[PDB]
């Protein structure tokens, strides 16, 4: 089970189609051949940014996964661990959020790099079946008190355009849906990656 928790990106500007920096986030799409190959496996799920080398400082976005997956916490209890894209970012924090996590970063200049921002260890249940798709969602959220971020150190006009791109075009959502066949079959085209098991029907 997953739900579509993402919200409509509604700050000014909301059209990032002319952003100098067009950050794209890719999420692991792990596919197992058989239920027996998948059952009880822990998969490292990477959240990997491209096109924003040296262009960002301040990030914060939501991750959710199918409720049937079991997260394997870090030694500190965190559900996500920072990756190489964040190695030059002095501030990095993951807060747990049920079947999900909130991941945030900060830097004293535009030290954000391309590559793996975060990883999440997700374990496939013992009763996994051929055909199962466990979707993994990156989502924008906002409320009047605060919202998700992908901006530069000064939070410049270009950083706000880059943020608009990141949330509207850089990640999948109900307004930018996946066409990946696994997510279509999962009825989760708002999601971004997955752990799947092949159905292997003629």
């Amino acid at each position: 089970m997953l739900t579509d928790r993402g919200m409509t990106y509604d700050l000014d500007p909301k059209d990032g189609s002319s952003a100098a920096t067009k950050p794209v986030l890719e999420v692991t799409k792990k596919v197992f051949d058989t239920a027996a190959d998948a059952a009880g496996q822990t998969v490292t799920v990477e959240f990997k940014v491209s096109g924003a080398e040296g262009k960002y400082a301040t990030t914060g976005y939501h991750i959710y996964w199918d409720e049937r997956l079991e997260v394997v916490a870090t030694k500190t209890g965190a559900y996500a661990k920072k990756g190489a894209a964040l190695e030059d970012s002095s501030l990095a924090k993951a807060e747990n959020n049920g079947n999900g996590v909130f991941v945030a970063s900060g830097a004293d200049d535009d030290f954000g790099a391309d590559g793996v921002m975060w990883t999440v260890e997700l374990k496939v249940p013992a009763d996994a079946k051929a055909g199962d798709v466990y979707p993994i969602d990156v989502a924008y959220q906002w409320d009047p008190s605060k919202g998700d971020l992908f901006t530069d150190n000064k939070d410049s006009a270009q950083g706000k355009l880059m943020q608009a791109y990141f949330f509207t075009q850089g990640i999948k959502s109900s307004s930018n849906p996946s066409t990946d066949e696994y997510l279509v079959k999962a009825n989760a085209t708002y999601a971004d990656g997955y752990i799947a098991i092949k159905a292997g029907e003629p």
């Binding site: 914060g60 909130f102 945030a104 959220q141 605060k146 901006t151």
Partner: protein, 84 residues
């Protein structure tokens, strides 16, 4: 001022944390302070009379808490770490 809101836009978020960290890195290398008056006061969230990466870490952690369980005010969160 609102504690934690160093850009005074009514929101405590990662931009506040990055701003405190940026000020700390500038001062550390000997540049002049840019945080004065109520900005300086807003940055010192643990009330230890200095602005450093512990303040920036606290703002970011509040931003992440408010983004998840959201079960404590910013003022109560920063008071947990202030001197009795």
């Amino acid at each position: 001022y609102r504690l934690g809101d160093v850009d005074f836009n009514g929101i405590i978020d990662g931009r506040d944390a990055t701003a405190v960290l940026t000020e700390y890195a500038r001062i550390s290398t000997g540049k002049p302070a840019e945080f004065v008056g109520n900005t300086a006061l807003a940055a010192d969230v643990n009330k230890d009379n200095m602005i450093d990466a512990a303040d920036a870490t606290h703002i970011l952690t509040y931003y992440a808490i408010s983004s998840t369980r959201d079960d404590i005010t910013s003022d109560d969160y920063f008071a947990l770490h202030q001197p009795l």
